[PDB]
Design a binder for these strands. Structure first.
Lengths: 50, 56, 313, 141, 83
RNA sequence: GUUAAUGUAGCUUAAUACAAAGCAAAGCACUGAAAAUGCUUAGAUGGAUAUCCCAUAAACA
RNA sequence: UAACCUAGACUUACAAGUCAAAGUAAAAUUGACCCAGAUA
């Protein structure tokens, strides 16, 4: 059975683990929007051309 | 008419006052023992089923 | 389909409550029945709290505690008066005292009724204090540097509904010390009538720009007459509105008590008034000669005396 | 004696006069809507994600006592927003204000999941130990 | 015109294995700002569907890269345009 | 320089008051998946007036 | 045991039985009456 200190350590790494995943998702989440918007912007450019 | 699920029985006071009331119970269950208000003693007492009146 | 659909009941409930609050064209229930430097300093302190590892761990144990006393004192200074104003408005002090005029309190007034010497019961807003605890005048303390402090029984009047009685009025109070105030009205113990419900008594503090002799408001000491204790705050404040601006509030609710019996008889020298809450008589339709399809109880509803009568017999 | 003169009918103007006695009217309808409105006072806790705010409001719709985590006094001594500890303190602060306000009886209407929550059960524990009653007494007819 | 909704039938020899990818792929799909109207399960091996609505040429390239990386073990991908 | 954009945090014509708000979004726990629920996370007025403003970046240049 | 009472209504030969604001009080596949029984 885990000791409170052992549970204390495991809980702590979850906190930083949560932060690490959050930052990656936010950067990756927004990167997708720019790419989709970028493609739409290019579509507008071709529409202006022809 | 053919269908028959419940039955009507007499619940008689266990206090000896002779007060009785009718209740409906399923035919396939055991005899009812219920705590009901008895006006003669003016307090709740145990009632035990005695006889079946009819098929409901 | 374009709009998203609520994934939980809470999102619907919160939106529904906001929608209900906003007015609508259709009839609704409500209509029918109803500086910069400081901010930088605050952030710096917050950052220090963030850094503290003990506080961080103190929260993971989900048992960390806060000192209520420190919070209470700071709360009064910053945003407490806004809460204080709400209490007076809900209790009806502004409408009953100033005929609807509203004043934001600014002075953190503090009053407490001393019980013996070991401890003193405080008098907060809306607090409950028994008449026995209010047998003697309370201790008043407030941070300031003249002043006038007034005592009222808003709903304790026995003859005129609008009028009210003063318990004691001190005038020309210099700075914080109150012993130098002129005792225009001697202290009287609370006298809420029996069966009359909960009486609200409010303490008022008014800023005094210049010393003014309130000879009209002076009352003989001791005075046991209710006919001379009667007054109105509105006209009294109107006469002195030039030099009086209210800044302090404190009120409590008290019931009848055995001490109230002593107050009515010993010094007020009158029989104690006794009142009872009388509900309106039950509504019954006009009696019919032939109560068709009605029980025998119909006659009993319209009878007054429960004893038999014999008329000529 | 001039003192003996007393009007036959008393006229008490205190809004809480009947409510404190227990004879004041409570709304008994709204059976088809949730929550029930048969309360003289209500405890409203809005967790609004981050911050936690608690209000006390009369049937007339005027808030009486409010405790919020944004308030400068609490936040400086309060580490973090909505959490188990969020109501561990503001609820206690609200209770002291409730005791300060003299409101000993109040009605709380949590939802099933909210009632099962951790920042609400502890809030109820903080209120009950402080002497604030989360269930109001029945009206007298 | 815009890309239609494309369904991915997670077919695996075990329903738990397809479930494991369904849990992760859908987790990444929401991370991909994707809407999953339905998650249908095919009849007995066990195959599971993860509806995906809203695609693009650039979105597909970033999305398919994520889908390949998310592949935990021995799961067979599939891309079919909805009727 | 002419046209034109862009300047509270993904979104908002939330707000300037007694808040720098709400929502979206994120992790873990909870085992069909998803979602919910509980416990947790990260943030802004680059700036004004009730159009200038400089910065930035385009077609003209 | 699933109440009593009581505005206003339903059902109904009569009678009884229903719904129901208020009040009060316990608690927290038949359907009545007449008419016959049982007994007290």
């Amino acid at each position: 059975e885990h000791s409170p200190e052992e549970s204390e350590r495991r809980a702590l790494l979850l906190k930083r683990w949560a932060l690490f995943k959050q930052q990656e998702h936010e950067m990756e989440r927004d990167a997708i929007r720019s790419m989709l918007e970028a493609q739409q912007e290019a579509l507008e450019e071709l529409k202006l051309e022809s | 008419k053919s269908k028959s699920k419940t039955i009507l029985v007499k619940l008689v006071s266990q206090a000896g006052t002779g007060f009785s009331f009718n209740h409906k119970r399923s035919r396939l269950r055991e005899k009812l023992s219920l705590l009901h208000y008895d006006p003669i003693v003016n307090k709740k007492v145990l009632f035990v089923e005695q006889k079946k009146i009819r098929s409901l | 389909e374009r709009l998203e659909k609520y994934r939980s009941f809470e999102r619907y409930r919160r939106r529904a409550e906001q929608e209900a609050r906003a007015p609508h064209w259709w009839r609704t229930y409500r209509e029918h029945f109803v500086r910069t430097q400081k901010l930088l300093e605050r952030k710096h302190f917050l950052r220090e709290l963030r850094a503290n590892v003990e506080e961080e761990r103190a929260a993971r144990l989900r048992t960390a505690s806060i000192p209520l006393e420190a919070v209470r004192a700071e709360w009064e200074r910053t945003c407490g008066p806004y809460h204080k104003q709400r209490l007076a408005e809900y209790y009806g002090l502004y409408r009953d005292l100033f005929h609807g005029a509203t004043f934001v309190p600014w002075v953190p007034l503090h009053v407490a009724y001393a019980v013996g010497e070991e401890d003193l019961i405080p008098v907060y807003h809306g607090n409950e204090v028994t008449p026995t605890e209010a047998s003697r005048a309370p201790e008043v303390t407030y941070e300031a540097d003249l002043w006038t402090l007034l005592f009222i029984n808003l709903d304790g009047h026995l003859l005129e509904p609008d009028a009210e009685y003063v318990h004691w009025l001190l005038t020309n109070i210099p700075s914080n010390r109150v012993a130098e105030g002129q005792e225009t009205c001697p202290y009287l113990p609370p006298f809420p009538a029996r069966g009359s419900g909960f009486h609200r008594f409010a303490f008022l503090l008014f800023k005094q720009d210049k010393p003014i002799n309130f000879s009209e408001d002076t009352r003989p000491s001791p005075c046991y007459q209710l006919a001379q204790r009667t007054f109105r705050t509105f006209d009294f404040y109107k006469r002195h509105q030039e030099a009086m601006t209210p800044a302090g509030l404190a009120f409590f609710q008290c019931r009848w008590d055995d001490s109230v019996t002593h107050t009515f008889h010993q010094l007020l020298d009158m029989r104690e008034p006794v009142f009872e809450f009388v509900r309106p008589p039950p509504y019954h339709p006009k009696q019919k000669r032939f109560p068709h399809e009605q029980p025998l109880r119909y006659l009993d509803r319209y009878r007054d005396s429960h004893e038999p009568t014999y008329g000529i017999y | 004696k001039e003192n003996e003169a007393v009007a036959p009918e008393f006229t008490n103007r205190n809004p809480r006069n009947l409510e404190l006695l227990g004879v004041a009217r409570k709304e008994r309808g709204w059976a088809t809507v949730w929550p029930n409105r048969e309360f003289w006072h209500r405890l409203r806790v809005v967790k609004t994600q981050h911050h936690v705010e608690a209000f006390v409001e009369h049937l007339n719709g005027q808030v009486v006592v409010s405790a919020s985590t944004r308030e400068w006094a609490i936040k400086k001594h309060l580490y973090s927003t909505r959490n188990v500890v969020a109501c561990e303190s503001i609820g206690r602060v609200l209770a002291q204000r409730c005791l300060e306000a003299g409101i000993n009886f109040m009605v709380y209407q949590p939802t099933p999941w909210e009632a099962s929550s951790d920042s609400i059960k502890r809030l109820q524990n903080a209120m009950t130990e402080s002497g604030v009653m989360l269930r109001e007494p029945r009206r007298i007819y | 015109y815009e890309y239609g909704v494309l369904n991915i039938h997670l077919t695996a020899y075990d329903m738990s294995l397809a479930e494991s990818y369904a849990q992760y792929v859908h987790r990444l799909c929401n991370r991909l700002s994707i809407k999953v109207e339905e998650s249908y399960a095919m009849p007995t091996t066990h195959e599971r569907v993860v509806q995906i609505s809203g695609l693009s040429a650039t979105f597909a390239e970033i999305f398919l890269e994520v889908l390949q990386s998310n592949l935990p073990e021995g799961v067979r991908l599939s891309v079919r345009e909805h009727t």
